[PDB]
Amino acid sequence: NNNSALSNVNSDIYFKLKKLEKEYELLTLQEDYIKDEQRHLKRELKRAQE
Amino acid sequence: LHHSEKKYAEEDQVQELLKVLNEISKTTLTLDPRYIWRSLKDLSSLRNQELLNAETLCFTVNVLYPDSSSFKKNLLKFITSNHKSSVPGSAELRNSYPASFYSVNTEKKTIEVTAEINCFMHLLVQLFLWDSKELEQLVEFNRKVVIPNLLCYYNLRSLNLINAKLWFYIYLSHETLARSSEEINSDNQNIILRSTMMKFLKIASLKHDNETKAMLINLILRDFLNNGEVDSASDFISKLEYPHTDVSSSLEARYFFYLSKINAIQLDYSTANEYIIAAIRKAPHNSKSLGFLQQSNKLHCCIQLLMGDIPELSFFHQSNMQKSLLPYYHLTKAVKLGDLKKFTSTITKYKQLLLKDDTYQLCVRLRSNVIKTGIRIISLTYKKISLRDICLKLNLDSEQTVEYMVSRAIRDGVIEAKINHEDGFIETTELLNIYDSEDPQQVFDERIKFANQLHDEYLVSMRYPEDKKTQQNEK
Amino acid sequence: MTAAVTSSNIVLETHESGIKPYFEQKIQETELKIRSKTENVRRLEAQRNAL
Amino acid sequence: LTKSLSIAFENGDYAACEKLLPPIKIELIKNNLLIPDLSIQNDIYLNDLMITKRILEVGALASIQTFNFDSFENYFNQLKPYYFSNNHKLSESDKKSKLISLYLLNLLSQNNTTKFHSELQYLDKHIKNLEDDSLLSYPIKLDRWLMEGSYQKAWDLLQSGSQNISEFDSFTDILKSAIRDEIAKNTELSYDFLPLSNIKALLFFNNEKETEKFALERNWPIVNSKVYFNNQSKEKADYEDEMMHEEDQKTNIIEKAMDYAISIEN
Amino acid sequence: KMLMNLHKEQWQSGLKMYDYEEKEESNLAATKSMVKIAEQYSKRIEEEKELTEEELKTRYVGRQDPKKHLSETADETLENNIVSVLTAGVNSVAIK
Amino acid sequence: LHVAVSDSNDDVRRAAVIALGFVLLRDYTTVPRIVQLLSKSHNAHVRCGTAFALGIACAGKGLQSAIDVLD
Amino acid sequence: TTAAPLLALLRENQDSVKTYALESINNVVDQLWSEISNELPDIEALYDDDTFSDREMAALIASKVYYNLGEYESAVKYALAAKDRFDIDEKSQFVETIVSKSIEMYVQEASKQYTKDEQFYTKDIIDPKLTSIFERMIEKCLKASELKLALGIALEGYRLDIIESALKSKLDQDSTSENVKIINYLLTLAITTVTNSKFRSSILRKSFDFLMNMPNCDYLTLNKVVVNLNDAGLALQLFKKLKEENDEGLSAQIAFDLVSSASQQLLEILVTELTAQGYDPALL
Where are the coiled-coil regions (chain A)? Predict the structure, then answer.
């Protein structure tokens, strides 16, 4: 346009997005786990009440 | 004089413009510009209406224009031309100001800023017409433009939200024109109207905006319902894409109304009950909403009579709806007391009133339901009663005539009896006491499924406002 | 630089650039998904923080 | 060629219509291209419209008269948008009023009552007082009597319905049968037994030997001049238990209680 | 493993249903008691809506919490009765 | 993560928390969010190891979220 | 205008009227889509039949109808069952929906077939059509300018030969600073996205030869490829090039860097091999 090599950096955005959404799969890892952690603490709640 | 008044409308708008504008060029924040846009419309109606009618043309000169000033002049020209204090240096508030685009920066080269401002401007046109109460030529002209404008460009998340209201105005004006007066043209534009919205729903699926999709479905559904095409509406709703994600409670009220109504004539009354009972409560309860609310109340009772159940006499009495709920009360009473002669006089007498609210086609079907109530009473009151006595009571023609009524009725389980042909009577089979039966378990399980639904429904929604509110900064 | 007199990109990269949100359609459908995941992973964190 | 179909109907040779119709079908595409199928209407198009329409209407009656219900269904569908678009100035015919009467009978005779009410809603605003109900009374009144459950008033309208012939006898004869099956289903619930004589009067026959034959085929044994309605009912029911989907739909005790505990425990 | 084990019918003690007199007792008590803590729950939320949370809880019986205690009883009697229904439905069908 | 919560021995829990930092040497940005949970909990051995996990991982130049959890 | 004739016309008997039903159906189907979704078997019947030559057109109708439905998956089989008259819609950016869906599919198949044998597009194991669409989808990126949009598509499709043909389109010295960067970005991606052992090793080593070919390059990029794979063979060859570009400052800068970066195993093997070859005792 007025500043060229606007078709190398357009594709760097794309490249970065495929990385980042894998690191929000690291929050979907965590999501199963916070279900199995509260599950465990509900168990140890039983054991403390006992 | 005039100039003073124009500067004030422009100034008032600038504020409104800023609010939605600052957010959307940060990055889209979809929900928040939507809530502001609702408030914005209300303040703009008063602004436009008073302090002359040439303010819209002015507001245009203040922002950037490629062809925006030109388009707006033609609209104004129609309602008698305006261009006084509407040209740069007297409708120009910029002159090195950065919110309204720096003047140096505007002259100097390329990159557009036309997008959001163009879209916003269109909304103002719609509202401008609607306040005037002139549709005709101006509407047709405006209609043609804005449709190829939205599709020239490819919409943003925010830009979707503005057309979700824009379409509502194009839809509605055309419905009023079509219902004014019948022409060859009236038939032509109906075709165009359906085509554009239905394609635009395809696009809007992929852009991820629920609010555009939700409005479109309502409009499209209203269209089948008007023109009596049951057949077109049944396909639309079975090839679902309705969102429950991001809507208003306005939108759920419209949707649930159209669904109930459509289902009624096609002989399903049970799910329609769910839909219309649902619609009333979701709708905002107010005195400016009285039109939509009044239409729902009329439908709901009519739908109760179709089942063979009876809505309250208490209902028609304590309302402040009494004037309009004048026909329904007699329609219910006629069915409740099961006299067929009363029912015939009623539907004749209120024929004009009902036709408007278009429950008239349903009133014809209720004549079945009359008979049903009238034989229900007889069976309950006398357990064992000869068909002879039923003829005396309800003025049936013969023994046979009533025999056939019952015979058909008990297949559907309405009267819940069995006929004794040889002894000449009807012997009723209801006797209760199902605390010996295993019946309570199914009943109870349906109640426990409602209670389980309420359990899922709280759990998801509760934390959700909390998580956003914790994320945002606080002391 | 800004205007609308002069069309962006000197009108040669608006239809050879509209084959590009389809490359990116896969990631933005999935981005939408992610926004409900974020809400959920603190949702159940609150329950276990109280617990 | 095109014009031959039009004069062939007037002859009264209605199979001659159908054997002539294939060339006219290729030539009917040419007719469709002249109109834009009414997305604009003009006065050039108004002459042409009469041509396109005339071919469909005479095929439509001709098909009913050779008892080709299928072919009729397709015709009606083509025709319907042509009356539907535009302010009237050639949007009706002498033939139309009769045509809608015939389609409404076809739905009733197949017992698709669901589509009978939908279709009437859409139909309403073309026949309200503009063609009015003048012939349309015949499937409409029949309908009023079937909803009420007066199988008696319903039978009489059919019986008097044979004096006036337009061509409705191809669907009256089918509707005579439709009634019997409806009555036959309802009387199973009512009683276990009706003497042979009481069966004839209810289920509408003119021979006592037909009444007995119908019963045998329908799976009621007449033994000692008493029908046993219960037979078929037991056999239908036995069949549902024979096929298996079956354990979950009814739901076991064990299954209800397992569902509670797992809802909680997520 | 030697410590963890128990009897030869401890691993075969869910088929051992209870006498139903005792189960009726369990049904009757839980419903009655909850009426009285519910009454207690009504009094608590009539006020408690001015400022300072602890004060309000000291004033209108928000300590000695009935809100917590009503939930607890309900849940407790709720998990029991799912298994009792489960037990009966198994033993009736399984044996005969 | 599984070893840490579900193992009923305190010593076992610790060794698992500390380990995380070795794996996540490459990307140390997300680690204070994994352990936010583990610092909330009040077991001596788990907390003692939450502290270390973060130390190994977020070395080099500081991380504002890491600093905050440790406080 | 209304879908009711178009329904009636397929059911009408004569070959010409059946061909006519197709042509009407496809022109207006974003008004009229709902009704012909129900009457789909007649459309599948015509596809089957080799007694029409508008068989292609009938598979084409089926792809539009499915798109409007929301059932995009079957759309691709039927869009590709028509073959031609798909180009019409490949340059249309309102129905590039099925054009794009085919590619998303390709990625999924490729990750399976990459363990069977490295080449699986060049052997036929997968549909020829799915392969043809991919390589024209790449063509569009190269109309728009630059190889980078395409590089990213192919990495995901486990097409190794495509990556090579693209990188050589930028070796000819257009401008060396850009040419190194265009490699630099692709390395940083390959380490973090593909974690599959074979594919990741290929991209680094393939990159190493391209980088060598220009005599002017960052040697910072070259050192990263060596260190990540920790091979002595890359390390030796790196010094053979530096042996024909030898001078005291340049050749020491990379050796001093290399020891810092690389592991103790690379260094131990590397010194012996340079001595057996012949080198200065100062470098060593």
Answer: none
B420 pairs with which residues across the strands?
Answer: B425
Alpha-carbon dihedral angle through residues B293, B296, B297, B300, given to the nearest 10 degrees = -160
Task: Determine which helix (DSSP H) or strand (DSSP E) holds D172, and give its type and residue range.
Answer: helix D169-190
Whole-Å CA distances, B445 to B2, B96, B271, B448, D257? 72, 71, 19, 5, 10
Rounded to an integer, what is the distance from CA D67 to the centroid of its chain?
13
Cβ distance C2 to B463 less than 8 Å, yes or no, reads no
Place of tokens 């009596």: B228
Nearest CA in chain F to A30: F34
The whole-angstrom separation of Cα D45 and Cα D31 is 11
Spatial contact of B211 and B164, defined as CB atoms under 8 Å apart = yes
Nearest to D153 by CA among D166, D164, D142: D142
Residues B212 and B161 sit within 8 Å (Cβ to Cβ): yes
Pick from B106, B115, B110, B111: nearest CA to B88: B106
Distance CA C3, CA B110 (A): 5
Q: Do C37 and A41 touch (CB under 8 A)?
A: no
**Chain G closest-CA separation from residue C40 CA (Å):** 26
Between CA D117 and CA D131 the distance in angstroms is 19
Q: CB distance D117–B265 less than 8 Å?
A: yes
Neighbours of B471 (CB within 10 A): 10
Phi, psi of D195 (to 5 degrees): -55, 160
Distance separating alpha carbons of residues D105 and D140, to the nearest angstrom: 9
How far apart CA D45 and CA D81 sit, in angstroms, is 15
Give the number of residues written for chain C. 51
D260 contact residues in E (CB cutoff 8 A) = 82
Question: Would an 8 Å CB–CB cutoff place B187 in contact with chain G?
Answer: no
What is the SS3 assignment for chain G? CCCHHHHHHHHCCCHHHHHHHHHHHHHCCCCCHHHHHHCCHHHHHHHHCCCCCCHHHHHHHHHHHHHHHCCCHHHHHHHCCCCCCCCCCCCCCCCCHHHHHHHHHHHHHHHHCCCCCCCCCCCCCCCHHHHHHHHHHHHHHHHHCCCHHHHHHHHHCCCHHHHHHHHHHHCCCCCHHHHHHHHHHHHHHHHHCCCCHHHHHHHHHHHHHHHHHCCCCCCHHHHHHHHHHCCHHHHHHHHHHHCCCCCHHHHHHHHHHHHHHCCHHHHHHHHHHHHHHCCCCCCC
Instruction: Confirm if B276 and B256 have CB atoms less than 8 A apart.
Output: yes
**Closest Cα of chain G to A22: distance in Å?**
9
Spell out which residues of chain G touch residue C27, defining contact as CB-CB under 8 Å: none
Distance from CA of D170 to the nearest CA of B (A): 27
Rounded to whole angstroms, what are the CA distances from D115 to B231, D136, G3?
8, 17, 17
Question: What experiment produced this structure?
Answer: cryo-EM
* List of chain G residues whose C-beta atoms are within 8 Å of the C-beta of residue A7: 144-146, 148-149
Rounded to the nearest angstrom, the gap between the alpha carbon of residue D79 and the centroid of all alpha carbons in its chain is 18
> Is the sign of the CA dihedral G105, G107, G110, G111 positive or negative?
negative
Nearest to G191 by CA among G207, G214, G171: G207
> Which residue matches tokens 């100035």?
D89
The residue whose two tokens read 């104004």 is B76
Cα gap D199→D208, rounded to integer Å: 9
Residue B385, strand partner residues: B426
* B425-428 and B384-385 beta bridge pairing: antiparallel
Residue G6, Cβ density class (10 Å: 0-12 exposed, 13-18 middle, ≥19 buried): buried
> Can you give the three-state secondary structure of B129-190, one letter per residue?
HHHHCCCHHHHHHHHHHHHHHHHHCCCCHHHHHHHHHHHHHHHHHHHHHHHHCCCHHHHHHH
Distance CA B192, CA A12 (A): 43
Residues in G touching C18 (Cβ below 8 Å) = 93
Distance from CA of B198 to the nearest CA of G (A): 6
Residues of G in contact with A12 (CB under 8 A): 148, 185
